[PDB]
């Protein structure tokens, strides 16, 4: 249910993780 | 002690209530249209602080609702920035 | 929250206003 909103928190994740 | 709501608090509530409907919607541009989300939400903070104090003008961050749509909604600031040159644009400022 | 397969909101919204969606008449 979360997925298409955690396919766009992890373009703002840093590149980092 | 009829709660004298802060221009603060009408932001921070405010900036609650587009953020967290907006996380679970965007990029659905149909249920989160963000040009007419900030073309109306800017409007109406400009509406209700144009009669304030010189002082309740400084509870306003110039970035109130542009830093959540980052942080939170994850909106790129490139496409803020012309989504805000189509705000300045196309509306009524 | 998008499903594929969810049962798509056929509503006929088309006769609402700010009024109506404002007021308890």
Known sequence: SEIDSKVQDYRFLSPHI | ?93 | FITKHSKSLNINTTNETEDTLRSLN
């Open chain 2, 1 to 93: 002690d009829g709660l004298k709501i802060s221009v603060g608090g009408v932001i921070e509530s405010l900036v609650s209530k587009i953020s967290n409907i907006g996380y679970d919607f965007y990029p659905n541009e149909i249920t989160f249209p963000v040009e007419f989300i900030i073309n109306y939400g800017e409007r109406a903070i400009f509406n209700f602080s144009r009669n304030k104090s010189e002082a309740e003008k400084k509870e306003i961050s110039p970035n109130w609702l542009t830093s959540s749509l980052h942080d939170h909604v994850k909106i790129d600031y490139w496409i803020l920035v012309d989504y805000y040159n189509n705000t300045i644009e196309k509306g009524s400022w």
